[PDB]
Amino acid sequence: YINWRMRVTLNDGRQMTGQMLAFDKHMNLVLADTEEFRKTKRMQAKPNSSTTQTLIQEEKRTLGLTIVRGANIIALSVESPPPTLTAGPGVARPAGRGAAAPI
Amino acid sequence: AQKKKEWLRMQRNRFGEKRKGGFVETQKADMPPEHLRKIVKDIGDVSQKKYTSDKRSYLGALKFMPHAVLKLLENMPMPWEAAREVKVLYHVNGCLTLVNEIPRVIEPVFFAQWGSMWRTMRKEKSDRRLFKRMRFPPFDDEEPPLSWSENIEDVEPLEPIQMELDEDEDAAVYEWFYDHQPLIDTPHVNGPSYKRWNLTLPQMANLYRLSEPLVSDVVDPNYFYLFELKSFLTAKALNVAL
Amino acid sequence: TPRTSNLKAPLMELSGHTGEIFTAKFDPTGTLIASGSMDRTIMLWRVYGDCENYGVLNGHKAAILDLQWSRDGDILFSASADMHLASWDLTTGQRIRRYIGHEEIINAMDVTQRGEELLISGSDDGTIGIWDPRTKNAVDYIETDFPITAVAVSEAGNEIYSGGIDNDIKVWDIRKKAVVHTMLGHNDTITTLRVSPDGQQLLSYAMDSTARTWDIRPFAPTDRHIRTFDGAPLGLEKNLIRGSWSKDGKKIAVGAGDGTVVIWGSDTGKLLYKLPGHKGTVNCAEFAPDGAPIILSASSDRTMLLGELI
Amino acid sequence: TRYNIPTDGVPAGNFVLLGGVDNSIVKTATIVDKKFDNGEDAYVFKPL
Amino acid sequence: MAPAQPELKKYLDKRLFVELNGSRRVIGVLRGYDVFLNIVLDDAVEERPNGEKVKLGMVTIRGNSVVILEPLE
Amino acid sequence: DLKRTLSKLGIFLKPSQYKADPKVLMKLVCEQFFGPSTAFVDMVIKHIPSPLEAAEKKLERYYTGPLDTKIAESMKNCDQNGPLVVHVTKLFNTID
Amino acid sequence: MTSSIGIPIKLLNEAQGHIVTLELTTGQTYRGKLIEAEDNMNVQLKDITVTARDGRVSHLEQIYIRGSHVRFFIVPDMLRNAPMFRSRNV
Amino acid sequence: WAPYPFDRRSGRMVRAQDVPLIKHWYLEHCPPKQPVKVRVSYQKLLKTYVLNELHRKRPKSMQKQSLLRTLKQTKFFQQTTIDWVEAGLQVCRQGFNMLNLLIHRKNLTYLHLDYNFNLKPVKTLTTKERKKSRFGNAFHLMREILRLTKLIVDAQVQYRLGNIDAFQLADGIHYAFNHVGQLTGMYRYKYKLMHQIRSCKDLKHLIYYRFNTGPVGKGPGCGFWAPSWRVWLFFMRGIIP
Amino acid sequence: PVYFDRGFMTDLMNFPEQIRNIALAGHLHHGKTAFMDMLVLETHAIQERLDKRTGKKRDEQLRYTDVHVIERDRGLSIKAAPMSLVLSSTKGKSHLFNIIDTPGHVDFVDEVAAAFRLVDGVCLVVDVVEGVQVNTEQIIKHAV
RNA sequence: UUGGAGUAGGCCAGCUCAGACCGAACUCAUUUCCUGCCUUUUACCGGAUGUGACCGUGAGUUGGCCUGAAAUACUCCCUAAUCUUUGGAAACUCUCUGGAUAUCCCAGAUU
Numbered sequence A: 001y002i003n004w005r006m007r008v009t010l011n012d013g014r015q016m017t018g019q020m021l022a023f024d025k026h027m028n029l030v031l032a033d034t035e036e037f038r039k040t041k042r043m044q045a046k047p048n049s050s051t052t053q054t055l056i057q058e059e060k061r062t063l064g065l066t067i068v069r070g071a072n073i074i075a076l077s078v079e080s081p082p083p084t085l086t087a088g089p090g091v092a093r094p095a096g097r098g099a100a101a102p103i
Numbered sequence B: 001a002q003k004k005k006e007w008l009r010m011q012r013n014r015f016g017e018k019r020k021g022g023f024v025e026t027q028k029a030d031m032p033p034e035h036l037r038k039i040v041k042d043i044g045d046v047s048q049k050k051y052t053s054d055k056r057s058y059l060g061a062l063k064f065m066p067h068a069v070l071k072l073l074e075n076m077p078m079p080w081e082a083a084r085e086v087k088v089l090y091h092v093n094g095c096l097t098l099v100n101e102i103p104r105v106i107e108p109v110f111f112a113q114w115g116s117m118w119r120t121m122r123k124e125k126s127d128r129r130l131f132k133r134m135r136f137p138p139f140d141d142e143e144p145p146l147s148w149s150e151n152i153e154d155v156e157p158l159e160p161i162q163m164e165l166d167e168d169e170d171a172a173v174y175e176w177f178y179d180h181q182p183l184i185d186t187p188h189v190n191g192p193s194y195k196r197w198n199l200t201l202p203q204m205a206n207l208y209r210l211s212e213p214l215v216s217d218v219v220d221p222n223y224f225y226l227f228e229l230k231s232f233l234t235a236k237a238l239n240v241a242l
Numbered sequence C: 001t002p003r004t005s006n007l008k009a010p011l012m013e014l015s016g017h018t019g020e021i022f023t024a025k026f027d028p029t030g031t032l033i034a035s036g037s038m039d040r041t042i043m044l045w046r047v048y049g050d051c052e053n054y055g056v057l058n059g060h061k062a063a064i065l066d067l068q069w070s071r072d073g074d075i076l077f078s079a080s081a082d083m084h085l086a087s088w089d090l091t092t093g094q095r096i097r098r099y100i101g102h103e104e105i106i107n108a109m110d111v112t113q114r115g116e117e118l119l120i121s122g123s124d125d126g127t128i129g130i131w132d133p134r135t136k137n138a139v140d141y142i143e144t145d146f147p148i149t150a151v152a153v154s155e156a157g158n159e160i161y162s163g164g165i166d167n168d169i170k171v172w173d174i175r176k177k178a179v180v181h182t183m184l185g186h187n188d189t190i191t192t193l194r195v196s197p198d199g200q201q202l203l204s205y206a207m208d209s210t211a212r213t214w215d216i217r218p219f220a221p222t223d224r225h226i227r228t229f230d231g232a233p234l235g236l237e238k239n240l241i242r243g244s245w246s247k248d249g250k251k252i253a254v255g256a257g258d259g260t261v262v263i264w265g266s267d268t269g270k271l272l273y274k275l276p277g278h279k280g281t282v283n284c285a286e287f288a289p290d291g292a293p294i295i296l297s298a299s300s301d302r303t304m305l306l307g308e309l310i
Numbered sequence D: 001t002r003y004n005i006p007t008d009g010v011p012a013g014n015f016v017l018l019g020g021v022d023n024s025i026v027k028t029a030t031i032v033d034k035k036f037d038n039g040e041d042a043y044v045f046k047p048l
Numbered sequence E: 001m002a003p004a005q006p007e008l009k010k011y012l013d014k015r016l017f018v019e020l021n022g023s024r025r026v027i028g029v030l031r032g033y034d035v036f037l038n039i040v041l042d043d044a045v046e047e048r049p050n051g052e053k054v055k056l057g058m059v060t061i062r063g064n065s066v067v068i069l070e071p072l073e
Numbered sequence F: 001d002l003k004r005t006l007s008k009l010g011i012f013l014k015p016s017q018y019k020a021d022p023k024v025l026m027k028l029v030c031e032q033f034f035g036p037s038t039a040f041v042d043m044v045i046k047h048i049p050s051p052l053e054a055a056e057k058k059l060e061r062y063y064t065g066p067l068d069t070k071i072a073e074s075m076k077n078c079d080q081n082g083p084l085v086v087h088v089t090k091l092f093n094t095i096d
Numbered sequence G: 001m002t003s004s005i006g007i008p009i010k011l012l013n014e015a016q017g018h019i020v021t022l023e024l025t026t027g028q029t030y031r032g033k034l035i036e037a038e039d040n041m042n043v044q045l046k047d048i049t050v051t052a053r054d055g056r057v058s059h060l061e062q063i064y065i066r067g068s069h070v071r072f073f074i075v076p077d078m079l080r081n082a083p084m085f086r087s088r089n090v
Numbered sequence H: 001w002a003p004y005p006f007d008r009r010s011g012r013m014v015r016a017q018d019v020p021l022i023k024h025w026y027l028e029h030c031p032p033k034q035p036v037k038v039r040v041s042y043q044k045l046l047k048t049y050v051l052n053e054l055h056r057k058r059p060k061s062m063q064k065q066s067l068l069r070t071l072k073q074t075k076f077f078q079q080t081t082i083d084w085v086e087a088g089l090q091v092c093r094q095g096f097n098m099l100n101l102l103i104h105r106k107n108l109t110y111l112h113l114d115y116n117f118n119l120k121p122v123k124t125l126t127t128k129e130r131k132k133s134r135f136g137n138a139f140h141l142m143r144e145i146l147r148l149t150k151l152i153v154d155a156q157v158q159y160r161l162g163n164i165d166a167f168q169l170a171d172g173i174h175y176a177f178n179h180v181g182q183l184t185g186m187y188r189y190k191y192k193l194m195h196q197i198r199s200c201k202d203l204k205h206l207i208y209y210r211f212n213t214g215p216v217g218k219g220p221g222c223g224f225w226a227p228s229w230r231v232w233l234f235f236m237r238g239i240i241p
Numbered sequence I: 001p002v003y004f005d006r007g008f009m010t011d012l013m014n015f016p017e018q019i020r021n022i023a024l025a026g027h028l029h030h031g032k033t034a035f036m037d038m039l040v041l042e043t044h045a046i047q048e049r050l051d052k053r054t055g056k057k058r059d060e061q062l063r064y065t066d067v068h069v070i071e072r073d074r075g076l077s078i079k080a081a082p083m084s085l086v087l088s089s090t091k092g093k094s095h096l097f098n099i100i101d102t103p104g105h106v107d108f109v110d111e112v113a114a115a116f117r118l119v120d121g122v123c124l125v126v127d128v129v130e131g132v133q134v135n136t137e138q139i140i141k142h143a144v
Numbered sequence J: 001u002u003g004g005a006g007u008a009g010g011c012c013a014g015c016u017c018a019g020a021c022c023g024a025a026c027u028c029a030u031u032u033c034c035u036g037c038c039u040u041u042u043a044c045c046g047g048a049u050g051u052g053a054c055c056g057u058g059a060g061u062u063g064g065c066c067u068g069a070a071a072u073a074c075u076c077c078c079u080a081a082u083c084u085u086u087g088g089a090a091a092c093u094c095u096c097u098g099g100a101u102a103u104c105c106c107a108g109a110u111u
Helices: B002-015 B033-043 B055-061 B065-074 B107-127 B201-210 B229-237 F002-009 F022-034 F038-047 F051-062 F070-077 G007-013 H023-027 H036-054 H067-071 H084-105 H127-133 H137-160 H166-178 H191-211 H226-239 I006-013 I032-043 I055-059 I069-074 I109-118 I134-143
Strands: A005-010 A015-022 A029-044 A053-068 A073-080 A091-093 B085-091 B097-099 B196-198 C011-015 C021-026 C032-037 C041-046 C053-057 C064-068 C075-080 C084-089 C095-099 C106-108 C119-123 C127-131 C138-143 C148-150 C159-164 C168-173 C178-184 C190-195 C201-206 C210-215 C225-230 C251-255 C261-265 C271-275 C282-287 C295-299 C303-307 D029-032 E015-020 E024-032 E039-047 E053-061 E066-071 F085-088 G019-024 G028-036 G043-045 G049-052 G056-059 G063-065 G070-074 H010-012 H077-083 H111-113 H119-121 I019-026 I081-088 I094-101 I121-125
Touching (some): A015 A053, A015 G007, A053 G007, B033 B085, B033 H077, B065 B097, B065 H084, B065 H226, B085 H084, B097 H084, B107 B201, B107 H191, C021 C064, C021 C295, C032 C064, C032 C075, C168 C190, C201 C251, C210 C251, E015 E039, E024 E053, F038 I019, F038 I081, F038 I094, F038 I121, F051 F070, G028 G063, H023 H036, H023 H191, H036 H191, H077 H084, H137 H166, H137 H226, H166 H191, H166 H226, H191 H226, I006 I094, I019 I032, I019 I109, I032 I094, I121 I134
Parallel strands (some): C021 C282, I019 I094, I019 I121
Antiparallel strands (some): A005 A015, A053 G070, B085 B097, B085 H077, C011 C303, C021 C032, C032 C041, C041 C053, C064 C075, C075 C084, C106 C119, C119 C127, C159 C168, C168 C178, C201 C210, C251 C261, C251 C282, C295 C303, E015 E066, E024 E039, E039 E053, G019 G070, G028 G043, G043 G063, G049 G056, H111 H119, I081 I094
16 A cells, blocks of 8 residues: 555644555554645634634645654545556568459 | 357367467377387398488488487497497488487586596406407408397396495495486486486585595695696797796 | 558558468557467557567467457457457556456457446357456356357447357347347358447448448337448358448448458448458458558458558 | 766765866875855865 | 663763653653663652742652653753 | 574575575575674774764864865865865776 | 564664654654664654744753654655665565 | 585586596696606697687577487487497498498499498409599598497497406597507598597596506506597587588 | 665765765785675675676676776786765664775785775774784774 | 465477576687698698687577376465553533634633
8 A cells, every 4th residue: 555645644633645655563654745734723703794704724834754653643545546568570561452353 | 050060160170279280299209219220120231122212312311420420429338337228310211320319417426437437447457467458440340240139139238347335435326326327316406308416415525535536636726826727828928838 | 642641651561470360450549550360479560650560469379369459559458269368568568467267269359448348258169258357257258059259349338249150140238148139131150240430330241251231229120231232252261350340430341252351332332442462361351440541451361451542 | 996876966075086187186186166265275185 | 572672871870851741840860760661760859830849859750651851961 | 404403593595595505505594694784884883983073183184274264164074065175086097 | 473673663763863853742843863763763862953832942952752752753855765665576 | 625516516417528537637737757758748738728728719609400409300310219339330330331332333343341441442453443433531531430430339349248348348448549540540531630649649648647556557457538538529529510 | 776776875975974984905815805795795786697607707706896907817906996885784774885995915005095095994804814914014004 | 464466397399599608618610821841732730810610508488298286285476561552531611822802602722
């Protein structure tokens, strides 16, 4: 299941998307090109509307190559998959189709 | 139903995996030795008129006789063999008999066998009183050639030159030392084609001990200082001699 | 009007097989050529340019009698008289895998061009095997009582066009594993069933030297037989002649046993061409799928003639 | 030794092989930039 | 097999501050340790968030109880 | 017997390799017993200084300029972003 | 049998001497040059610039952290192409 | 610490002639207290080794079909397994009948070719008979090669008949291979052959001076015939084309 | 083809604290190039080409850093030959080693002297049977 | 350990590659020269320089033969007692900060 672009969910609710490079026996996962996205719920109150809208703002920070312990790892989901003809003895010669044949 | 039978038969007789070429093909086999024996006996010296069709070919096989001489003398029996059998490729007129073999040996085994020959011949020459050398040529000129069947076919041969191997000291090679192709039916060679060998440490030690009169006692390569090939080539290029 | 195409010569003779060619197919973009022949070999050529034999595929233990291309043209599909199917990779020239489960000689096969990927093999034990091109085991197989020499997949992907030595085209359904209906009318052993590119006509040449075009459409009379073209007599050998359609569905090209490939007009039944050029029987006569006037005729002269239709 | 790996840059404190420069070295040499950033002088290492 | 012992031989008999769970601080001198990070220290002074230092003397902290450590010398 | 003994220690070889010549079998056995040259790497790391810890000594011994200049600090700390200085001593002839 | 350590533990062990950022489970992340490592991920750092999620930025020297409280670790990019990642096919 | 191949425990088989049993005798320094003839034999053998090494070639053989394997593919050649002595007797009779048919086809029946391969006129020849009969170097070189082959085969046959013992057989084989110039006129039709003759004498010197040492006396008895046999095999290799 | 990555090796040039520059030095035929062959055969994938050798060249020592024709024919090193390698410590951490093989003959020892200007450490290879000889004394005296 | 991929040993024959060392061994012919011996030519002498043939070799692949094995077993590639998995968990409130700002609510932090 290595080298597949996946997103893993941490125990603190933070998501990490990237290419899974290696995994161990205790599920300690080392992944490269990691982007940590946190979906924090914020109650933004408009100046004209009295109802405050609860929006899940996603803050994304690029970390790079990160190794995470398996005790704080919760779950992961795959996002995207991964991203000798020898020459024979044949020859080609122009030719002609020969004499016309009766029906 | 006749259509199904004839279609299946046609399809098999055209696309079966035994007829890739149109005919059932086999591997060329070995005739009895008595076939060649009868042919050579029948043609004799080519003096009957029956074999007038066989004369042009026979005289034309003169061209390949040198090559037969090479193969015959190459596959000669060694002194420890009373007799040897060889595969021959023979012409069906009896014109040519080419020995179809390569005298392929294990180098430690061959080297030790010939070293034991050196020992045995020296001991016998020290033990014999008067050594009668054989006459050359062995047979008088006007004698007809010896037929195999009447003269040699059933005759028990004499004892070959072999050394009295000690049963206890030479127990590694005792049972196979003087066989024709030693260890051919063992897990010590790849098979009957006899092309790779492996020998255990006791066997290699025993073969090293038996080859003492021949094997080299030089261990240090520094023994060959200024007496190696590059030194001889340098001395040749310089018109000097070591 | 000397020459109107992209080939560097109006005729090219592709040679290099040491045995009789039985099939030859085009890449569905009209760019690559695959020919399987009785010397157990699939030779892979370019059609545009200097036309080098860029590849040879070995690995069948007996005569090769069919091959289709994939959707893109990256995986080849070879049926062979070693009772086997095989899927081949053209990125490396190696073999992906072999499909096993037939007991006698395999004559036909078909890949579903669009729909879901299935290989459809007619084999002389009396079987029509439906295979998935990822597992070597047969997904299913339909039992008949006669050898099958012809097979085509429907446009809807569930009807099977079998043709046996029992002299009639049978349309089966995969789900019920039973024959839907038989277009009878032929007198001799069926060889090729190729659906029309639009999908309403079926070409069928049999050993009686007559090539008939039939209906495919669900609304049709009792006799679905459109036309019986004649003019391509079959020779001495009882080969499995493989005809084809043009891209526009207007021209019918079938090889013949005199070395001549015969093209009729599918609309009316007029002999458009009677192109000579071969010594033995012509086994596989095909059009260019791109729509160019390129025709290919692979014959058991160990040769292929790649020519033009001006 | 058996071969050479061509690269666009060899950093400080390492071993380097330079080609196109040999015309002036006779026993030992010190290779520096054309002009320093502060316009300072240049000094040589001790002879071997 | 048996887990590897922590690399704290240079930290022996030195002033160290250990932060433990409950946001507690312990300032002391290292006296010994074990494979399971059971640290025994002498002249320990415990500090809560109020900043009050209470002397305890010889104290022991388990491996799970120990969170962070830092040498004071 | 060799298979039994080396499996008793925990060294495993393919059965074709157990029948090799004594010198090559010896090389394979010692290679799988001792392993790679990590001990030499450890010895060099522990007992031989890095360029950062030896460049000051190199400047003190074999450099004829003053040590208070910025070029001296650049040579001493082995910075990449400093100006170029290379001490060339050896000359190797090319392939031709 | 022979005990096989994880590839991620090997990448942590090979990261010694380069600056890495370790964030514990307490919300505090310290970035500094790692000076040691262990099989139980108990790492000691020397530069240790610490930032706590309550907003506390500080600097400390020679701080040792056990592997239990350590949540995430980020190492240098060069070790992304390390010799460990090559699939050995003997 | 044994020399090759005694420090190995696995290997490939070599041909029997491709084992030089005494090459290290002259590849090493000569022992002290030698006769001058033995020393110059050592030097001559070393010269042959050096000149073989200097003219080592790289012919790039790929266009070579075997004679025996191509002959096996026909209907006119079959295969069997027979005794070596039977094959030698057959080869000698075949070559004799071939030369006899050639002589009789040219209507030269006044020349008798006897069974030891000597061509002698049965009567006094005229000038035209002598002119028509003079044979060539191909006939005569083949006839003397056949004569040496006959000598070797009759040595083996005399062993197989009980007339000589095995030590006598090995001694006779060594004698025949060391006395080709005396027992044949084979040098008459190819004089470069004398090189081979010289080589055999050189080997004999070495062999004798290590054989007749100690209680071993003089005269016949030396059956160490392998190196001379090798020399004549390599001659036949070159003389075949 | 080697068993490390050249991009990884170039990136480990970028960290000059984990780099060691050493010179292998010692007497004639005491095993400097044999040591370097050990390192090379650990890193480079050239066992496949060496296992195809036959004849007397099957017994030839590789001698990767003997490349002058003098060195191949005389059988001794005459030029200080440099290499760069990636070698792994017991902790699994890879290090870039810039090593110099020096000649051991008592005449080419100036090459040794040249290498002793360039390196930070001296790995002195000494035979256990012959022990310390005159060039070992000269190299030890200089490096001390 | 698993999935899928597979398939025995010996011998025989074809084809392609290999000279660096195919060969731990070793012959012959020959072009252009130099030299020896020679009345002439063949046959020779012995160094250079190339160029051919022969006796053999290895690896890959393809077809067949022999004997077994019989959908077998084997092989291939790959990964509940202190620090990662048998949870000090769960639950809610208080206080503080921000948005709203009269409150409810929510985020974050703490008990």
